[PDB]
Symmetry: C2
Subunit: 557 residues, 2 copies
């Protein structure tokens, strides 16, 4: 209840508008109306003549016209007139998506397929299905500015992408993957909003002034009328769930979400999802168990969260990188720690932050976390979106892949990664306001030294996927994923991990594994048969003893 | 460890100074030295020639000289040179102060005694002791600007009041009350700092920029180097405890304390206190159980918190007042609710805040809360610090007193209140900077319509206590307090509360009680003997039946 709503032959036009004294519905084709200012601030109007797939605009005191910020669809553009649409209505009380079987596929509809749409992504389903992926993570689709954005400048939480195809598309996309047995997962932004076409700012107080994130400010979940803003949101989830049978959510930068209420909006949100037996994941910097933790342990109960710690230990290890966050890691130990104690910063000094970061994860299954060697952030923010293939030797890159998929964690692949893809994932934007299409420039430029003019179509297309398969890489993966399942590796953290100067043997429940970064002697303490190797130099049948190995990775049993 | 520290014949000069490249110790009489910039930001120097009750100043890059912000003493003034002092050193691992026996006496050293010092307050001990008070709550003494402040512009957390007597004084004051069996309780500010003479602002980043309270900003417990700032503080408590055998603390406006860390600085602090088997109370707006709640229930474990809800229900009821917060209450029901469900806003709509305030207190004893009909805030913020005596009829004022002391809660009296005192408690300030001595004016003026120029000595003295005893009132109290003890009323919330249109009978474990705001029939459901009455019209021996009563209060058995 926030945009519109169809009764019978009736449409209702709710409108959070505290700051307005008089607002007017304005079916573009029909006419202009007068809202029902209620004490809370909700102008309102009831219709029946409309059914029409009509474009409308709210016209406020000021003299300006605008679009339903809970717009179900912004066809014409961000300044486009909101529009009417059917009520998707059907969905099911459940996601086939059990967790343990989680393989995530981060996909950016845009640059993915050359089409760059749902359709685009539909074609690849079976490819995906094949790969072994258990679920698809769709980058943000909340109506953004222009046509070329990662999707982080979304400004219409309720409105589905113009470009990407929109509603039906998204609709189909899911219905489809559903059929193919593919789980879809939406990545939503609740910690901020796009710098273009955001009108909230006039209707009332959607955002809190008490605080300031980095991308401006978060919403108002606290002061003034938090009730309303915090309802926006919670409903906003229920929608996706109901009007799109979505299978789960991924929350951008939760730590930019400030709530002091006795009930943190997270836990607030989690609830909504778990109510529909859906799933939630969150991007979270704070090395805080709180998030993922259960209620009984004072946790918001989010299902699982990303663990950038895992990455870095690996990445900066393989690459000789030590910039920005990289400085907190880049060492063998880090990798193992992360391996047996989820966080590398369990409550310790980050010179990076000059603070005393995070704290002990408990005894939570590896399935509360989601590891990865790549994602838009990790690639995207480089200034030259270097894919990881471009900074490590092939043996290495093969090893990595192992690590992350052979973890108890919840492996998720960046798109392209599995087939050995090499184009960069740049930072691109499609903003109309001069001042942004400028700020943005010295931004990335100063922030990430990105020479590519994000506003340049080039930068965009340059990031598109070159579907140039590399069966070497491509095959590997396919197995790994398959081995993992076969293997029963998921969630389970009952693991022994050894390491030598440049090596790392890791027992599991049913298997072992070798990671050798450099020719070296190893006192292998176990007997099993080869399951897979990076190289050929690996002994189909192994036995406990001292052997010399070569830069590579092998898998026992 | 933050100011100084004496080894043997040695003094150490620690100094959090991230932003400085070079700082210099400067014994005023001796010389100027060079600090030991450490990687963290701590300039430092070690001395032995000093022992001297020497005044010193840190001289920074900039070219300015300043005083140890962890100054143990600012004799000369706020811009006064910090100074050396002995190590109080002794204290005991315990406070005789059990809770259940808590009667608080909020005292403002300044305007109290005509002396207006510790001494001043020392003279009254036995008076106090008599009254029945179990402990003394000292308004803020953290070195403020000037001589006339409630003490909320403190700026030297470590430094004891010039005016009020200082160190020895404070020292004695406690040693004294200790002897007289009186418990002393300090009221500390950790959610902000005085607008005058605050240097922190240059030494490094003591305050967080991410947020903004109302009185500017809180400290940095989160970002950058929170470690250091959050250490300042935690030590700051331990000091009071060790260098002053203090018995407990009262925390101003905790809800202005923002911490996102896995361990809220509160809980952080609580720990420190409970470590010394001391006691903590906090002023807290958020109707959140969290505070007071126990660890096992995800609470910071503060010992108890104020419950302004209680007040208002009563006050606005007795007075016909409905301004500012008053609007959320002023009705019989409110009073009872508050009476059996601590908070009146257990999670409900405050038009006052236009939000959905607070939440259910659990099943915590009445001793987690502290009720009261008066305090500096409640009186102070009126623009004309009207004492409550001046707005309700005498019968009423007698009734009130009953209510609050006959509660399971933790009654605390404002100074003056017990003997029927009528001078106002105004808002007064003693600032030197023109711009404040101006801001402050239209402030109070606009905020509270306070005509009194807070900066006017008048306003100050006018607030001093006129020790004009009124044995009518004075006696009453004395009993009440005595009855309470006798009675076994404390902490226990196993209470039945009835009310009629204008009356309120309240059983307890061992007693009942009548509150009649207006001539009315009452179906008294019990038999007991008169224990005390506001009036004389009360039946020494009572029995269950319908009787007509007169505006007053009576106590059975």
């Amino acid at each position: 209840t926030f945009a519109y709503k169809i009764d019978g032959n009736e449409v209702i036009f709710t409108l959070w508008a505290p700051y307005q004294k008089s607002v007017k519905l304005k079916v573009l084709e029909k006419g202009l109306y007068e809202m029902e200012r209620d004490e809370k601030g909700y102008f309102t109007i009831t219709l029946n003549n409309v059914k029409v797939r009509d474009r409308y605009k709210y016209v406020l005191d000021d003299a300006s016209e605008i679009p339903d910020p809970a717009s179900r669809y912004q066809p014409e553009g961000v300044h486009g007139p909101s529009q009417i649409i059917q009520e998707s209505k059907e969905f099911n009380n459940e996601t086939f998506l059990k967790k343990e079987d989680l393989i995530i596929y981060e996909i950016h509809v845009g640059t993915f397929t050359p089409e760059g749409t749902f359709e685009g992504v539909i074609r690849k389903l079976d490819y995906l299905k094949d790969l072994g992926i258990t679920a698809i993570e769709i980058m943000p689709i909340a109506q953004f500015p222009g046509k070329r954005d990662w999707g982080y400048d979304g400004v219409y939480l309720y409105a589905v992408q113009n470009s990407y195809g929109g509603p039906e598309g998204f609709r189909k996309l899911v219905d489809e993957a559903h059929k193919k047995g593919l789980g879809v997962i939406l990545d939503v932004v609740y910690n901020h909003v796009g710098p273009e076409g955001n009108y909230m700012v006039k209707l009332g107080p959607y955002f809190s002034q008490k605080y300031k994130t980095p991308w401006g400010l978060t919403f108002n979940f606290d002061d003034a009328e938090s009730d309303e803003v915090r309802k926006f949101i919670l409903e906003n989830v229920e929608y996706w769930i109901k009007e799109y049978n979505v299978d789960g959510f991924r929350l951008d930068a939760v730590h930019a979400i400030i709530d002091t209420s006795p009930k943190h909006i997270l836990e607030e949100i989690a609830d909504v999802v778990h109510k529909y037996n859906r799933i939630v994941i969150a991007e979270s910097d704070l090395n805080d168990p709180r998030v993922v933790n259960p209620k009984e342990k004072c946790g918001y109960n989010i299902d699982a969260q990303w663990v950038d710690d895992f990455h870095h230990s690996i990445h900066a290890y393989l690459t000789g990188e030590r910039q920005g966050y990289y400085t907190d890691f880049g060492n063998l130990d880090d990798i193992v720690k992360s391996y047996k104690d989820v966080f590398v910063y369990d409550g310790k000094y980050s010179n990076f932050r000059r603070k005393t970061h995070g704290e002990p994860v408990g005894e939570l299954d590896g399935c509360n976390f989601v590891v990865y060697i790549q994602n838009h952030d990790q690639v995207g923010n480089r200034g030259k979106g270097e894919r990881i293939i471009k900074l490590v030797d092939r043996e290495s890159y093969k090893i990595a892949a192992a690590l992350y998929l052979l973890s108890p964690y919840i492996p998720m692949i960046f798109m392209g990664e599995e087939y050995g893809e090499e184009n960069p994932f740049y930072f691109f934007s499609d903003f109309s306001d001069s001042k942004l299409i400028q700020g943005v420039r010295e931004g990335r430029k100063k922030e990430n030294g990105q020479d590519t003019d994000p506003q340049d179509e080039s930068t965009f297309n340059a990031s598109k996927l070159s579907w140039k398969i590399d069966e070497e890489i491509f095959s590997f993966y396919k197995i790994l994923i398959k081995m993992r399942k076969e293997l029963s590796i998921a969630c389970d953290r009952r693991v022994n991990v050894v390491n030598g100067e440049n090596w790392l043997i890791i027992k599991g429940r049913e298997y072992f594994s070798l990671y050798v970064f450099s020719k070296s002697s190893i006192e292998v303490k176990y007997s099993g048969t080869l399951l897979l190797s990076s190289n050929n130099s690996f002994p189909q049948h192994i036995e406990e003893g001292k052997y010399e190995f070569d830069k590579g990775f092998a898998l026992y049993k």
